Amino acid sequence: PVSMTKTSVDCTMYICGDSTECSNLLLQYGSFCTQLNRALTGIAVEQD
Amino acid sequence: ALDPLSETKCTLKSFTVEKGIYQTSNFRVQPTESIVRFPNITNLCPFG
């Protein structure tokens, strides 16, 4: 094997899909899900 | 909140964006109306 599947997970659509309160609550956690998505994009580009 | 270039500027937290491609949370289409579906129940109450 050479490469894996290029998964991309949207943190907001996953945790607080179609809602405002949970997104406003998660906004207090900083950049966790955003940096996880950035790491996933890095995984994808390194697979490429 | 004006153009996607400024959106990428907010994303990278810098006034200068290099040659590349980025974005943020996905844009979702909202439902136009609400459709209620319920049976056509035939049994009536014999109040008559």
Swiss-Prot record, chain B:
Effect of mutating residue 48 to D: In strain: Omicron/BA.1, Omicron/BA.2, Omicron/BA.2.12.1, Omicron/BA.4, Omicron/BA.5, Omicron/BQ.1.1
Glycosylated sites: 32, 34, 40
UniProt superkingdom: Viruses
Sequence segments annotated as region (Disordered): 28-44
Oligomer status and interactors: Binds to host ACE2. RBD also interacts with the N-linked glycan on 'Asn-90' of ACE2. Cleavage of S generates a polybasic C-terminal sequence on S1 that binds to host Neuropilin-1 (NRP1) and Neuropilin-2 (NRP2) receptors. Interacts with host integrin alpha-5/beta-1 (ITGA5:ITGB1) and with ACE2 in complex with integrin alpha-5/beta-1 (ITGA5:ITGB1). May interact via cytoplasmic c-terminus with M protein. May interact (via N-terminus) with host bilirubin and biliverdin, thereby preventing antibody binding to the SARS-CoV-2 spike NTD via an allosteric mechanism.
Functional note: Attaches the virion to the cell membrane by interacting with host receptor, initiating the infection. The major receptor is host ACE2. When S2/S2' has been cleaved, binding to the receptor triggers direct fusion at the cell membrane. When S2/S2' has not been cleaved, binding to the receptor results in internalization of the virus by endocytosis using host TFRC and GRM2 and leading to fusion of the virion membrane with the host endosomal membrane. Alternatively, may use NRP1/NRP2 and integrin as entry receptors.
Protein name listed in UniProt: Spike protein S1
Residues of the full protein shown: 292 to 339 of 1273
